[PDB]
């Protein structure tokens, strides 16, 4: 009755699964060039650094 | 015969059960469960406009 | 021909809340201040700032 409530509850714990998502949100009103120059920067700065 | 002016709008409108709504998502606290986290939501819901 | 005038970049000027053009500036004490502009005309990728 103590260690039961001491244990927190979860649901479907996370594994590796080999995939990852990156989400980019430029400030509102910006064009696709301003978003693209951030996106290719963030792939080129974590394609060889990782 | 035509002028213009700048207004302030939303680029993504959304509806739930055929009525206008907005959608909020998040995670529970690190170490806390989802039951008490969802219990830590509806006490804020009374602090809304009618 | 306009004399010595201000051409702000389009990345720094934005509209808000049934109102007019605004920009965020850095103060003398490195604080962020909101300023009200009357930017109307577009020169390339700049706003011709008239007052503000």
TrEMBL record, chain A:
It is found in: Cell inner membrane. The lineage of its organism: Bacteria, Pseudomonadati, Pseudomonadota, Gammaproteobacteria, Pseudomonadales. Coiled coil: none annotated. This is Efflux pump membrane transporter. It comes from Pseudomonas aeruginosa. It comes from the Bacteria. Belongs to the resistance-nodulation-cell division (RND) (TC 2.A.6) family. The gene is mexB.
From TrEMBL, chain C:
Coiled coil: none annotated. It comes from the Bacteria. Residues 5-52 form the Multidrug resistance protein MdtA-like C-terminal permuted SH3 domain. It is found in: Cell inner membrane. Belongs to the membrane fusion protein (MFP) (TC 8.A.1) family. This is MexA family multidrug efflux RND transporter periplasmic adaptor subunit. It comes from Pseudomonas aeruginosa. The chain holds residues 345 to 396 of 442 of the full protein.
């Amino acid at each position: 009755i103590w260690m039961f409530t001491r244990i927190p509850t979860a649901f479907l714990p996370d594994e590796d699964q080999g995939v990852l998502f990156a989400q980019v949100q430029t400030p509102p009103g910006s064009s696709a060039e301003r978003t693209q120059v951030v996106v290719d920067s963030m792939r080129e700065y974590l394609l060889e650094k990782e | 015969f035509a002028t213009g002016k700048w207004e302030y709008g939303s680029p993504k409108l959304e509806r739930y059960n055929g009525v206008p709504a907005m959608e909020i998502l998040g995670e529970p606290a690190p170490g806390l469960s989802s039951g008490d986290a969802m219990a830590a939501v509806e006490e804020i819901v009374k602090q809304l406009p009618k | 021909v306009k004399q010595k005038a201000i051409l702000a970049p389009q990345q720094g000027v934005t509209r808000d809340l049934k109102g007019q053009a605004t920009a965020l500036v850095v103060n003398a004490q490195n604080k962020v201040e909101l300023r009200v502009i009357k930017a109307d005309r577009v020169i390339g990728d700049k706003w011709l700032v008239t007052e503000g």
